[PDB]
Design a protein that fits this description.
Chain A: One of its GO terms (biological process) is DNA-templated transcription. Chain A: Belongs to the RNA polymerase beta chain family. The structure is cut from a larger assembly and holds 1 copy of chain A (about 1350 residues), 2 copies of chain B and 1 copy of chain D (about 80 residues). Helix content of chain A is about 30%, strand content about 20%. Chain A has about 1350 residues and is an alpha+beta fold. Chain B is elongated. Chain B starts with 14 loop residues before the first helix and ends in a 23-residue tail after the last strand. The chains are: A alpha+beta (about 1350), B mainly alpha (about 150), D mainly alpha (about 80). The site of zinc ion has 8 residues of chain B, from loops.
C-alpha cells in the first residue's frame, strides 16, 4: 500500500480478480518518436533507412560519389520554458558526417584520387516532451496517429452495375507504399481488362505480350490442356475423368467395348467414379466431337514451313485432315467447362490485336503519354521505372508479407518491388474465384487496415527533402572542380527544414491541444482518424466505414465520437490497446489449459482470434479448477455462441477490455442507453476545473491513473523527506539508499502559477502535503487544477430532488439556490491576452511614452513614466495600457473645423497616439507583463525595470539553488576538519574560513588541504559558470522581424461565476440550461430543515433511458449517511476504538469484494487523519460491469439509518406545506462546460463593413453582424411582407444613401425610407460586362 | 439476429447486449445526420419551381375539374371524402342520394356544417373546381383553391 | 492592398490579368521581325490558353495554379453556386441592427411578450435614444448624448422603457423550415444575459432548452411595425396553414398536472357529499379537508345558445371530482361540463381548444391556454412527482417464459442436429417464438402497472 | 535583385559555418555594407498573399471577411 492511499481510500464493489493492471497509457507516441530518431544498426527504422535508401549517391554519371556514414544530434539552445516564452520552437540541431570520394574512371577504378571527410549541419529537429507533446512558436501542439488502407493486395466484387445483367463484377487490385497502382477486372461480357492508375480500359494479355511472353508459354501455364491422339483413321482422346463432371454427354460416351453414358444424358459422379477406378484414359471417339475445341499451339507441316494452324484458333475437320497429311498424330487443345474452368483469357487473346513486345509497349507508352510519338528506349525505360525500379515504387515490407500471406506463401519477405510470378498467381486467384473458389475479402476487417504513427510521417518529409537536395547535387557533381568542391559547398539544408517545419505546424494533423482537463489531453492524443492524406473524405465516404465490425471488440470502443458528420470516422482507442510492429493492433487474452484459466497472456491481432475461440469474464469461475457450468457464452468466426468447457482455448481478461476511458469512468453504465452515454462522455470534455477540486464520491478507480499520466502535475522520482516548502515550490532530500554518492542527489520542483491555457483559462498546481514527512518514489506531492490527493475531479457533488417547479424546469432546464454562488464553488477564472507592438515606418518609428495629448489625466495616472500601467491594477473597457505614438503626416480640413481651430487656436503635433486599450465589456485584473526587444536596440526604462527584475528573480532563484547546494555540500568541511586534527571546543567559536591554517600535521592533512583547495576553487568556478551563463542568456535581446523595435505583452485575468444562460450537466446526458437561481426560503426543506441545492425536471428519464444515474443518487445520499455521522463523532469527540470498529465494519459491509483492510495495523493518528478527511463523505469505486447491486446500497442505508427507498417526505418553503407524496433525493455529481453566455452573446447597431460589397461582417471579435439566409426571405414573402425585407436589403446591408439618410432621420424621430438600388447588383453587372457582354437596362 | 436480449436496464446489462445495441444506434444517428441535406436540397428545388405563382382572380369562370373519392381501400377509411374536401369548392350542381336535393349554385364553400349535413346522406364521390381546371392567365382564381387554413 | 503586418495581398485575378498583357506586347515585338511563324504560333497558343484559363480555368483542361500548388479563380467562380454572389452576397446576407443569444424560459409570460436581456437592447435602440435626448434638451448633441449613454444614468433606462412601449421585435431560430420559425413578439426585459421564452412555441421552432441560441432583428420602420403586429404576431398565427390543426399543444407537464388533478379514484375522503359551487370546493381543498381525486355530487352551471347570438342561462347538479369543479371556473360562457369529467390526455385538450376556436375564435382561446399553462404547472408542483427504482416493476415470471423458450430452442437445435429443418425454417421458428415471449411479457408487465 | 541573390549566397554559408541563422551586423561585415539597407531589403523582400487564401480550418471562409473598409466615413461623425 501507499501513503496517499492512507490519506484517503475510496471503496470497492467489484468481485472479479483482475490479473492485469493497466499499462502506461500513451506509450505509443513516445515509442514512435523514439524509433524515428534514435539509432538502428540493421533492422532499419527511422532516419537510417531513409538515408541508406537514398544513399550512396554518385556524380552525374559516376566519377565522384557521396557516402552516408552516421548522424549527430545536437542538444538544443534553450530549455522548454524559454522557448515557451519567447514564442519559439523547441528543437535540436542535426549534423551528419559525410565522405566525398572521387575515383579515376580515367584509370580503371582508380580510387585513390581524393577524399573529403567532413560533417555538416542541415536542419534542426523539433522534439517531444516527456509527456508526449511538441511545442512551436510558444504554442503547445500535438499531431494524431492516422488509420488507413494498408498496402498489399485486395479483391472485391461489385454488384452488377450493368444491372441489366444482375451479374457479379470480380476485380482485384494491388496497392504499394509508393509508386503506381494496378487494376485487374472482369467485364460483364466475359473478358479481362486492366488499367494502371485509373487509366483507360486495356486488356490483360496486352501486358504479357509487352513482357516478352509467348502465346505458347501463356497457354502453357494458364490452362489445363485437352489433348487428343489420332492414329491414321480417327480420334482417340484422354479424359481426366472429372471433366464431364455433372455435364451432359454428346455421343455414346463409352469405355473400351462398353458404354457408361449414352447420348444426351447426365454423366453422373458415379459414372466418372467408374472411369476413375476402371482405369481407362484412351478413348476412341467420333472426330466430329472436335468441332468447337481450340488448338493448343501452332503445329504445322513444317516441310513447307507454312501455317496450317496458329494458336488460339478454334478447330475444324478439314484442318484435322490437313494436319493428318502433316502426319502429326496429336495436337493438344484447350479445356472449357463453363462450371469449373474459364476460357475468358483465351477469349481475351482473341480480342488482343497485338503480337510483339514492341508495339505493346508502344501502346502502353502512348496511353500514359498521350499525343507522344513511339520511341523504343523511352517505352522500356518507362515500364522499367514503374514496376521494377527501386526509385519510384515501394511496398514497405508490410505490403510484401501481407501479399505473400494472401497468396498462402511460405515466405514473408522479399523486396519492395515486383517479380513476375506475383502477377501470374494473382490473376490465377482472381480467375479461380471467378469460377467461385476462395473468397473476396472485407475492407473493414482490421486485419486489412493499418495505423500511421508519427515516425512514419516524419520519415516521409525528411527524405523528400533529401531528394529535393540530390536533384541539385546530380546537377552539380560531375560538372565543375573535383578537388576544391567541398561536400558542404552543394548542400542547402533549407529544403529539409522547410518541409519539416511546414509539417509540424501546417499539416491538418497538428492541432492546438486541449488545455481544459487532463483527460482532454490524454484522449485528444489517443485519437485516431482516417482523414487527411492517404485517407478519405466525408463526402467521398459512406456508411459501411462509419459503422462497426465485430473485430473492433477489444481494440476500439464504439461509444466516443461526435454527432456531426465525422461520426464513425474518428474512433478513439481502447484501453489495453497495444499495436504491432507492422502497424497492426492487438489485444490481450487469457490462456485456457484443460479447463484451467492460467494467468499468462497473449496479445492477439484482428485475425487469429476468429480462427480461435474466446470466452468472457462475466463467467463466474469455479475457484482455481475449471469453469462452473457447461454452456459458456463464447465467440469465434465473427459472432457468438455457447460452448462446452474443454471446448475452449482462450478467455477474455477484464470487464472493461473494450471501452474507452470516458467509456470507463461512469458507473452503472450498464443501466443506460448507448447514445446518451456517448453524448455525456462527449460532454465530459468541455469542462473546467473550477476554483476548487470538489471530488466525486463515486467512480471506478481510473481517476488517479489518468491524473498521474496526464503529466500536468508533480510526482516523486525518488523517495525521501521534505526539507522546505512554500506555496511557490518545495524542496526535498533523498534517502541515502536511493542516493548516488558523487552527485549532489538533492532534488527540487518549481511549480506553475497562473498561466494562460490554450483555451484561455487559468492553470495552477498546488501542494497537498506537509513537512517533516517521509516519501517514496512516484508519490505525488502536488496536484493539478482538477485533482485532489492524486485523484481526478472536475466538478462538484450536491443536493437534488426531482420534481417540477412552476415551469422553471419545463424542458430539461434547471433551477438552483443562492448559497452555491455565494460559496463561489463553481466560480472560475479566465486568463486573457492582449499585446501591442513598436515598429518602424516610412516616416519613422512608433515609440513608447506616456506623454500623449488629449488625455484624461487620471487615465495617465495608472501609468509609469514609460507610458505603462503598473501591476495588480484594475482595468475597465476603454482604459489604456500603453502610450504608443506614431509620426503623423498631414490633415486636410474643412472650413468649420478650420473655424473652431481659428477661434481657439489649438493644434495637433506631427504625432498621434496608438494606445492599446481594453476591449469593450471586458474588465479585470493585471498580474503580469512581458516585454521583448531586439538585440541591439536600447532597452528603455521599464524594459530595464522588468529586465533587471527577471535578472534579480532568476538570480535569486539561482543563488538560492546555489546556497542550498553549497550548503549541503559543506558536509565535508566539518567531518574533515574536526578530524585530521581536533580542536572542536577551540575551533567552533572561531571564524569558519581561518581553519586551513591551524595546527597542521603529517601528509594526511596536506592531502586534506589540497582537496579543500580544489573544492573551494570549484566554488567560484560554479559561481562564474552558472550565473554568467544565464546572465547573458537573459540580457541578450530577441529574435524577431524587420520593422519591429520591441513589443508589449499583458497576461491579465478575470473572474467568472455563475449566472443564467449557462450550460451544465452530468455524466449521463442530463444536459441543461440554467433558467433561474432562487433564495433558500423558496426552496424546499426536509423535516430536519436541510434545504435543497438544485432541482430539475423528472419527466424525460424514460424519454431517453438515462436510467442508471438515478441509482447513484440513492448511493449518493448514502455516502453522507456515513459522513455526517462521523462528523458527529468529531464534535462529540468520542474516542479511537469506537470509530475504528465502525469503519472497518463499514469497509466489510458487502459480501465478497476483494479489497481487504486491517486498521489494527494503523496508528491512532493515521486513523484520525483518515477520518478528518472522510468527515465530509465516503467515496466509492464500483467498476462498470463488475458493478454493484441495490442490495448493498439498501444494506448501507440501513447502516446509515435511512430509508430503503432513499425516498422521503418533503415540504415547501414559499408556503410551508407538505407535498402529497415522497420524493427521491440524494447527491449527484455535475459540472460546467465551456459554452458561456458572454462567450456566446453579441449584438450590433452599426459598424464594420466590407469594401468588395460594403455590407457588414461576422465574428464577435470583429464586431459581428448577423446573417439572414435565403429561406427566411421565403418565409417573409409567405406572410406577404415586402416592406420588411425591402428594408433588410436596401439599408441594413448594401444601399448607402438610404442607410445614412435614415440614420439621420430616425435621430429626428423619423421612421421613413428612401430606397435606391444595391451595390452587389452593379458589381455583378460590371463582372458580366468584363465577359464581353452588352447587358444594360431599359428606360421606362 | 439469432439470439435475443434476456434482460432490461434495471436487471443490468452485460457486455454484448450493449455492444450490439451500439451499431443499431449508430446507424440511427448516421441516418439522422443527412436527411437534412437532401431535405433542404430538394426543398430548394421545390420552391424554385414555384417562384412565380400567385392569386390574381376570384372565380375563373371555368369548367369543373376533378371528382373526389375516398381512400377506403385495403381496409376501412383513412381519409374520408367528408374530411378531405373540407374547405374546397363545389364543381357543379350536385345533390344527394335522396335525389333532387341540391345544395349549390355550382360553387359553394364546404365548412363542416356541410360535411355533417352530407354525412347524413350516403354521398360517396363529389366533384371540385381545382387549379388544374382554373384558366387564369398568370394567376389563379380564388374559388379554384379552397380556404386559407391559418385564417 | 496591405494589412497591418506590412504585407500586401492580391486579388489573384491580377496575376491572371498581368501575364496576358506582357505576351501581347511580346508578340508586337516579334511582329517587327517576320520571324519563323512557328514560334509565333507558339505565342498565339500561349495567349489563347491564358485567356480561356482566365475566363474559366478548369474548362479547357489543366487548372493553372499559383506558387502554392493551388488553383486560381476565373471570373465565373465569383458567380457560381455557393460562393456565387447570388447565395453568398446577394441572398446570404449580413444585417445591421441585429443580435443573438442563448434562450431560456419565462414560465409566467403573456405569450405575445418576450424575454430580453437589456444591454442588447441598449445597443439596439441607440440612435433612437440619441435623437430623444436631443429632443428633451438633456443632451442637445450626439457626443453629449453618447457620454450620458456610456454614463448610463437612470433617465436613460427610463427612456428605454419609454421607447420599447409599442415598439416591437422579431425573432429567428435556425433552420427556418416553415414560416413559424419566426414570430413577431413584444418586448419585455430581464436582468441577465439570456432570453426568456414562452414554453409553448418551442415546437413551432423544434427548440429544446439544451444549449439553444436564436437571434433578433428589428421591425425598424412603420410598415414593418404594422405587419409584425398584425401578421407574424404569434396571436394571429396559431394554425398550421399546411393543415389547420393548431400548434399550441401543451407538451409534457401542464398535461401531467391536469391529468393528475382531474382524476376519478375513490381512495381519499370528503366523499358522498355536496357543495354549492366550486368556490368553497377550492376553499376546503386549500384547508386540507378533502383531496381532489374523490367523486362528489355537487352543483354546476353552464351556458349555451342555439340563438342569434343570445345566451342561455342553465344550471344543474352532477357527480364530479373536485379539480374538475375548480377548472370549470375559467371557461367562458360557451361550453358544457361534458368536457371536464374525464382524465384529460392530450387530445382532449386539443379538442376543448379547437371547439373554443370554432365556436368563439381567438382571444378567449389564447386566454384559456394561458390559464391552462399557469394552473397546470401550479397544481403539478403541489402534485408531487418523483421517480425511483421500485417505481419500475419487473413481473415475477420473467425467468420462466425464458426457460421454456430455452427448452423450445433446445428442441429445434437437436432436430436440426438430426438435420431435418433447413436453417431458414429454424430461423423463422426462432424469431416467431421470441416475439411471442416479448409480447406476452409486455402483457404481464402492463398487467402489474396499469390499474392494480 | 542581385543584392538579394548574393545576400542569400552568403546566407547559405553562414548557415553552415554557424549552424545558425545570420545576424544583420555579421553579414553586413562580411559584405561590408550598412544595416538599414538590410532592414529595408528584408522589409521589401517578401511577396503578396492572395486575398482569397483559406484562413479557416476547412473552407470555412477565406481571408476576405477578415478585411475592413477603413477608408470612407462614420455615419456618426457625418451627422
Ligand atoms: Zn379557376
Amino acid at each position: 500500500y501507499s501513503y496517499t492511499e492512507k490519506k484517503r481510500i475510496r471503496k470497492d464493489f467489484g468481485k472479479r480478480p483482475q490479473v492485469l493492471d493497466v499499462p502506461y497509457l500513451l506509450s505509443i507516441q513516445l515509442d514512435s518518436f523514439q524509433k524515428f530518431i534514435e539509432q538502428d544498426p540493421e533492422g532499419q527504422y527511422g532516419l537510417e533507412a531513409a538515408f541508406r535508401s537514398v544513399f550512396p549517391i554518385q556524380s552525374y554519371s559516376g566519377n565522384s560519389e557521396l557516402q552516408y556514414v552516421s548522424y549527430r544530434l545536437g542538444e538544443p539552445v534553450f530549455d522548454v520554458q524559454e522557448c515557451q516564452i519567447r514564442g519559439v520552437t523547441y528543437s535540436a540541431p542535426l549534423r551528419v558526417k559525410l565522405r566525398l570520394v572521387i575515383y579515376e574512371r580515367e584509370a580503371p577504378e582508380g580510387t585513390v584520387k581524393d577524399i573529403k571527410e567532413q560533417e555538416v549541419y542541415m536542419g534542426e529537429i523539433p522534439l517531444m516532451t516527456d509527456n508526449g507533446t511538441f511545442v512551436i512558436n510558444g504554442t503547445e501542439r500535438v499531431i494524431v496517429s492516422q488509420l488507413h488502407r494498408s498496402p498489399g493486395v485486395f479483391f472485391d466484387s461489385d454488384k452488377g452495375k450493368t444491372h441489366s445483367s444482375g451479374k457479379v463484377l470480380y476485380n482485384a487490385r494491388i496497392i504499394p507504399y509508393r509508386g503506381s497502382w494496378l487494376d485487374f477486372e472482369f467485364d460483364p461480357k466475359d473478358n479481362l481488362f486492366v488499367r494502371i492508375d485509373r487509366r483507360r480500359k486495356l486488356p490483360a494479355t496486352i501486358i504479357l505480350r509487352a513482357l516478352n511472353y509467348t502465346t505458347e508459354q501463356i497457354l502453357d501455364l494458364f490452362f489445363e490442356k485437352v489433348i487428343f491422339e489420332i492414329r491414321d483413321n480417327k480420334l482417340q482422346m484422354e479424359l481426366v475423368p472429372e471433366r464431364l463432371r455433372g455435364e451432359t454427354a454428346s455421343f455414346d460416351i463409352e469405355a473400351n467395348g462398353k458404354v457408361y453414358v449414352e447420348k444426351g444424358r447426365r454423366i453422373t459422379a458415379r459414372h466418372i467414379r467408374q472411369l476413375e477406378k476402371d482405369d481407362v484414359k484412351l478413348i476412341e471417339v467420333p472426330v466430329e466431337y472436335i468441332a468447337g475445341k481450340v488448338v493448343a499451339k501452332d503445329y504445322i507441316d513444317e516441310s513447307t514451313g507454312e501455317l496450317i494452324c496458329a494458336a488460339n484458333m478454334e478447330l475444324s475437320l478439314d484442318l484435322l485432315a490437313k494436319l493428318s497429311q502433316s502426319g502429326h498424330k496429336r495436337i493438344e487443345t484447350l479445356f472449357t467447362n463453363d462450371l469449373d474452368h474459364g476460357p475468358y483469357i483465351s477469349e481475351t487473346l482473341r480480342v488482343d490485336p497485338t503480337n510483339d513486345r514492341l508495339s505493346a509497349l508502344v501502346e502502353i507508352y502512348r496511353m500514359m503519354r498521350p499525343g507522344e510519338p513511339p520511341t523504343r528506349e523511352a517505352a522500356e525505360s518507362l515500364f522499367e521505372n514503374l514496376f521494377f525500379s527501386e526509385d519510384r515504387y515501394d511496398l514497405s515490407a508490410v505490403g510484401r508479407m501481407k501479399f505473400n500471406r494472401s497468396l498462402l506463401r511460405e515466405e514473408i519477405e522479399g523486396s519492395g518491388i515486383l517479380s513476375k510470378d506475383d502477377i501470374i498467381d494473382v490473376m490465377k486467384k482472381l480467375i479461380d474465384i471467378r469460377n467461385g473458389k476462395g473468397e473476396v475479402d472485407d475492407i473493414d476487417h482490421l486485419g486489412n487496415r493499418r495505423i500511421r504513427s508519427v515516425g512514419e510521417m516524419a520519415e516521409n518529409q525528411f527524405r523528400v527533402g533529401l531528394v529535393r537536395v540530390e536533384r541539385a547535387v546530380k546537377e552539380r557533381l560531375s560538372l565543375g572542380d573535383l578537388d576544391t568542391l567541398m561536400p558542404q559547398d552543394m548542400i542547402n539544408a533549407k529544403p529539409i527544414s522547410a518541409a519539416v517545419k511546414e509539417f509540424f505546424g501546417s499539416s491538418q494533423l497538428s492541432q492546438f491541444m486541449d488545455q481544459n482537463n487532463p483527460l482532454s489531453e490524454i484522449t485528444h492524443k489517443r485519437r485516431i482518424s482516417a482523414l487527411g492524406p492517404g485517407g478519405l473524405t466525408r463526402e467521398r465516404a459512406g456508411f459501411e466505414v462509419r459503422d462497426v465490425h465485430p473485430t473492433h471488440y477489444g481494440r476500439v470502443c464504439p461509444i466516443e465520437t461526435p454527432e456531426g458528420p465525422n461520426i464513425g470516422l474518428i474512433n478513439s482507442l481502447s484501453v489495453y490497446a497495444q499495436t504491432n510492429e507492422y502497424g497492426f493492433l492487438e489485444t490481450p487474452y487469457r490462456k485456457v489449459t484443460d479447463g484451467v484459466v492460467t494467468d499468462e497472456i497473449h496479445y492477439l491481432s484482428a485475425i487469429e482470434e476468429g480462427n480461435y475461440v474466446i470466452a468472457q469474464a462475466n463467467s463466474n469461475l469455479d475457484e482455481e479448477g475449471h469453469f462452473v457450468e457447461d454452456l459458456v457464452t463464447c465467440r469465434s468466426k465473427g459472432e457468438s455462441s455457447l460452448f462446452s468447457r474443454d471446448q475452449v482455448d482462450y478467455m477474455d481478461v477484464s470487464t472493461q477490455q473494450v471501452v474507452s476511458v470516458g467509456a470507463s469512468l461512469i458507473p452503472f453504465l450498464e443501466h443506460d442507453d448507448a447514445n446518451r452515454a456517448l453524448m455525456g462522455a462527449n460532454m465530459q470534455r468541455q469542462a473546467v476545473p473550477t476554483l476548487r477540486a470538489d471530488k466525486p464520491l463515486v467512480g471506478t478507480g481510473m481517476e488517479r491513473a489518468v491524473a498521474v499520466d496526464s503529466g500536468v502535475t508533480a510526482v516523486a522520482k525518488r523517495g525521501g523527506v521534505v526539507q522546505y516548502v512554500d506555496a511557490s515550490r518545495i524542496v526535498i532530500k533523498v534517502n541515502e539508499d536511493e542516493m548516488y554518492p558523487g552527485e549532489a542527489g538533492i532534488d527540487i520542483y518549481n511549480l506553475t502559477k497562473y498561466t494562460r491555457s490554450n483555451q484561455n483559462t487559468c492553470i495552477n498546481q498546488m501542494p497537498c502535503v506537509s513537512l517533516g514527512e517521509p516519501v517514496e518514489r512516484g508519490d505525488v506531492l502536488a496536484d493539478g487544477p482538477s485533482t485532489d490527493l492524486g485523484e481526478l475531479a472536475l466538478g462538484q457533488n450536491m443536493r437534488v430532488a426531482f420534481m417540477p417547479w412552476n415551469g422553471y424546469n419545463f424542458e430539461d432546464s434547471i433551477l438552483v439556490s443562492e448559497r452555491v454562488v455565494q460559496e463561489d464553488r463553481f466560480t472560475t477564472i479566465h486568463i486573457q491576452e492582449l499585446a501591442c507592438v513598436s515598429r518602424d515606418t516610412k516616416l519613422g518609428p512608433e515609440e513608447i511614452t506616456a506623454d500623449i495629448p488629449n488625455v484624461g489625466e487620471a487615465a495617465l495616472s495608472k501609468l509609469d513614466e514609460s507610458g505603462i500601467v503598473y501591476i495588480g491594477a484594475e482595468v475597465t473597457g476603454g482604459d489604456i495600457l500603453v502610450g504608443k505614438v506614431t509620426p503623423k503626416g498631414e490633415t486636410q480640413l474643412t472650413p468649420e473645423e478650420k473655424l473652431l481651430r481659428a477661434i481657439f487656436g489649438e493644434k495637433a503635433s506631427d504625432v498621434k497616439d496608438s494606445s492599446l486599450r481594453v476591449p469593450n465589456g471586458v474588465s479585470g485584473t493585471v498580474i503580469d507583463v512581458q516585454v521583448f526587444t531586439r538585440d541591439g536596440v536600447e532597452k528603455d526604462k521599464r524594459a530595464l525595470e522588468i529586465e533587471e527584475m527577471q535578472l534579480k528573480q532568476a538570480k535569486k532563484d539561482l543563488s538560492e539553488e546555489l546556497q542550498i547546494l553549497e550548503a549541503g555540500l559543506f558536509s565535508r568541511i566539518r567531518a574533515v576538519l574536526v578530524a585530521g586534527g581536533v580542536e572542536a571546543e577551540k575551533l567552533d567559536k572561531l571564524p569558519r574560513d581561518r581553519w586551513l591554517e591551524l595546527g597542521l600535521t603529517d601528509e594526511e592533512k596536506q592531502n586534506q588541504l589540497e582537496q579543500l583547495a580544489e573544492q573551494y576553487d570549484e566554488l567560484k568556478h560554479e559561481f562564474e559558470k552558472k550565473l554568467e551563463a544565464k546572465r547573458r542568456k537573459i540580457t541578450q535581446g530577441d529574435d524577431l522581424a524587420p520593422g519591429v523595435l520591441k513589443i508589449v505583452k499583458v497576461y491579465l485575468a478575470v473572474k467568472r461565476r455563475i449566472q443564467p444562460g449557462d450550460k451544465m450537466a452530468g455524466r449521463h446526458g442530463n444536459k441543461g440550461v440554467i433558467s433561474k437561481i432562487n433564495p433558500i426560503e423558496d426552496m424546499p426543506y426536509d423535516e430536519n430543515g436541510t434545504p435543497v441545492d438544485i432541482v430539475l425536471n423528472p419527466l424525460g428519464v424514460p424519454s431517453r433511458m438515462n436510467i442508471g444515474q438515478i441509482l447513484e443518487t440513492h448511493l449518493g445520499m448514502a455516502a453522507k449517511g456515513i459522513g455526517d455521522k462521523i462528523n458527529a463523532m468529531l464534535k462529540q469527540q468520542q474516542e479511537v476504538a469506537k470509530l475504528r470498529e465502525f469503519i472497518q465494519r463499514a469497509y466489510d459491509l458487502g459480501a465478497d469484494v476483494r479489497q481487504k483492510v486491517d486498521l489494527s495495523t494503523f496508528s491512532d493518528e493515521e486513523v484520525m487523519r483518515l477520518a478528518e478527511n472522510l468527515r465530509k463523505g465516503m467515496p466509492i469505486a464500483t467498476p462498470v460491469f463488475d458493478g454493484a447491486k441495490e442490495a448493498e446500497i439498501k444494506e448501507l442505508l440501513k447502516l446509515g439509518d435511512l430509508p430503503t427507498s432513499g425516498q422521503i417526505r418533503l415540504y415547501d418553503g414559499r408556503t410551508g406545506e407538505q407535498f402529497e407524496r415522497p420524493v427521491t433525493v440524494g447527491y449527484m455529481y455535475m459540472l460546467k462546460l465551456n459554452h458561456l453566455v458572454d462567450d456566446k452573446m453579441h449584438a450590433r447597431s452599426t459598424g464594420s463593413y466590407s469594401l468588395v460589397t460594403q455590407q457588414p461582417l461576422g465574428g464577435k471579435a470583429q464586431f459581428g453582424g448577423q446573417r439572414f439566409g435565403e429561406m427566411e426571405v421565403w418565409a417573409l414573402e409567405a406572410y406577404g411582407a415586402a416592406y420588411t425585407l425591402q428594408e433588410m436589403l436596401t439599408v441594413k446591408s448594401d444601399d448607402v444613401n438610404g442607410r445614412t439618410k435614415m440614420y439621420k432621420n430616425i435621430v429626428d424621430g423619423n421612421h421613413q425610407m428612401e430606397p435606391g438600388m444595391p451595390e452587389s447588383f452593379n458589381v455583378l453587372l460590371k463582372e458580366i460586362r468584363s465577359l464581353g457582354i452588352n447587358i444594360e437596362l431599359e428606360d421606362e | 439476429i439469432e439470439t435475443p436480449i434476456t434482460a432490461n436496464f434495471r436487471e443490468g446489462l452485460n457486455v454484448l447486449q450493449y455492444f450490439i445495441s451500439t451499431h443499431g444506434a449508430r446507424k440511427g444517428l448516421a441516418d439522422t445526420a443527412l436527411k437534412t441535406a437532401n431535405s433542404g436540397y430538394l426543398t430548394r428545388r421545390l420552391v424554385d419551381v414555384a417562384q412565380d405563382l400567385v392569386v390574381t382572380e376570384d372565380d375563373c369562370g371555368t369548367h369543373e375539374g376533378i371528382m373526389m373519392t375516398p381512400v377506403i381501400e385495403g381496409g376501412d377509411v383513412k381519409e374520408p371524402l367528408r374530411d378531405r374536401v373540407l374547405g374546397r369548392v363545389t364543381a357543379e350542381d350536385v345533390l344527394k342520394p335522396g335525389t333532387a336535393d341540391i345544395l349549390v349554385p355550382r360553387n359553394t364553400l364546404l365548412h363542416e356544417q356541410w360535411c355533417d349535413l352530407l354525412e347524413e346522406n350516403s354521398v360517396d364521390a363529389v366533384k371540385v373546381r381545382s387549379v388544374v381546371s382554373c384558366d387564369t392567365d398568370f394567376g389563379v382564381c380564388a374559388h379554384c383553391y379552397g380556404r386559407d387554413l391559418a385564417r | 492592398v496591405p494589412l497591418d503586418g506590412g504585407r500586401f495581398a492580391t486579388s489573384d485575378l491580377n496575376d491572371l490579368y498581368r501575364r496576358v498583357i506582357n505576351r501581347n506586347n511580346r508578340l508586337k515585338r516579334l511582329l517587327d521581325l517576320a520571324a519563323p511563324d512557328i514560334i509565333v504560333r507558339n505565342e498565339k497558343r500561349m495567349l489563347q490558353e491564358a485567356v480561356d484559363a482566365l475566363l474559366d480555368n478548369g474548362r479547357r483542361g489543366r487548372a493553372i495554379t499559383g506558387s502554392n500548388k493551388r488553383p486560381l479563380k476565373s471570373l465565373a467562380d465569383m458567380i457560381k453556386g455557393k460562393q456565387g454572389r447570388f447565395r453568398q452576397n446577394l441572398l446570404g446576407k449580413r444585417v445591421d441592427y441585429s443580435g443573438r443569444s442563448v434562450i431560456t424560459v419565462g414560465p409566467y409570460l403573456r405569450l405575445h411578450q418576450c424575454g430580453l436581456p437589456k444591454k442588447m437592447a441598449l445597443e439596439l435602440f441607440k440612435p433612437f435614444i440619441y435623437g430623444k435626448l436631443e429632443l428633451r434638451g438633456l443632451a442637445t448633441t450626439i457626443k453629449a448624448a453618447k457620454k450620458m449613454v456610456e454614463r448610463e444614468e437612470a433617465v436613460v433606462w427610463d427612456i428605454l422603457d419609454e421607447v420599447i412601449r409599442e415598439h416591437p421585435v422579431l425573432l429567428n431560430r435556425a433552420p427556418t423550415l416553415h414560416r413559424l420559425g419566426i414570430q413577431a413578439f413584444e418586448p419585455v426585459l430581464i436582468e441577465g444575459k439570456a432570453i426568456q421564452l414562452h414554453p409553448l412555441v418551442c415546437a413551432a421552432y423544434n427548440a429544446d432548452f439544451d444549449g439553444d441560441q436564436m437571434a433578433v432583428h428589428v421591425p425598424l420602420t412603420l410598415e414593418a411595425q404594422l405587419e409584425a403586429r398584425a401578421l407574424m404576431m404569434s396571436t394571429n398565427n396559431i394554425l398550421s396553414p399546411a393543415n389547420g390543426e393548431p400548434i399550441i399543444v401543451p407538451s409534457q407537464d401542464v398535461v401531467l398536472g391536469l391529468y393528475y388533478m382531474t382524476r376519478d379514484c375513490v381512495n381519499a375522503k370528503g366523499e358522498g357529499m355536496v357543495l354549492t359551487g366550486p368556490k368553497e370546493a377550492e376553499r376546503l381543498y386549500r384547508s386540507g379537508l378533502a383531496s381532489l381525486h374523490a367523486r362528489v355530487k355537487v352543483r354546476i352551471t353552464e351556458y349555451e345558445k342555439d340563438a342569434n347570438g343570445e345566451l342561455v342561462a342553465k344550471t344543474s347538479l352532477k357527480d364530479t371530482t373536485v379539480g374538475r369543479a375548480i377548472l370549470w371556473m375559467i371557461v367562458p360562457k360557451g361550453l358544457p361540463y361534458s368536457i371536464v369529467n374525464q382524465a384529460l390526455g392530450k387530445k382532449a385538450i386539443s379538442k376543448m381548444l379547437n371547439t373554443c376556436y370554432r365556436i368563439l375564435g381567438l382571444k378567449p382561446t389564447v386566454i384559456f391556454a394561458d390559464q391552462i399553462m399557469y394552473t397546470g404547472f401550479a397544481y403539478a408542483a403541489r402534485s408531487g412527482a418523483s421517480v425511483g427504482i421500485d417505481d419500475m416493476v419487473i413481473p415475477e415470471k420473467k425467468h420462466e417464459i425464458i426457460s421454456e423458450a430455452e427448452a423450445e430452442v433446445a428442441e429445434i437445435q437437436e432436430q436440426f442436429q438430426s438435420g431435418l429443418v433447413t436453417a431458414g425454417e429454424r430461423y423463422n421458428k426462432v424469431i416467431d417464438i421470441w416475439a411471442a415471449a416479448n409480447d406476452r411479457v409486455s402483457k404481464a408487465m402492463m398487467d402489474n402497472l396499469q390499474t392494480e | 535583385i542581385e543584392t538579394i541573390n548574393k545576400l542569400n549566397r552568403i546566407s547559405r554559408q553562414m548557415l553552415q559555418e554557424m549552424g545558425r541563422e545570420p545576424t544583420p551586423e555579421e553579414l553586413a561585415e562580411r559584405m561590408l555594407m550598412p544595416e538599414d539597407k538590410i532592414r529595408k531589403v528584408l522589409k521589401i523582400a517578401k511577396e503578396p498573399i492572395s486575398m482569397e487564401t483559406p484562413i479557416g480550418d476547412d473552407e470555412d471562409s477565406h481571408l476576405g471577411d477578415f478585411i475592413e473598409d477603413t477608408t470612407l466615413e462614420l455615419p456618426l461623425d457625418s451627422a
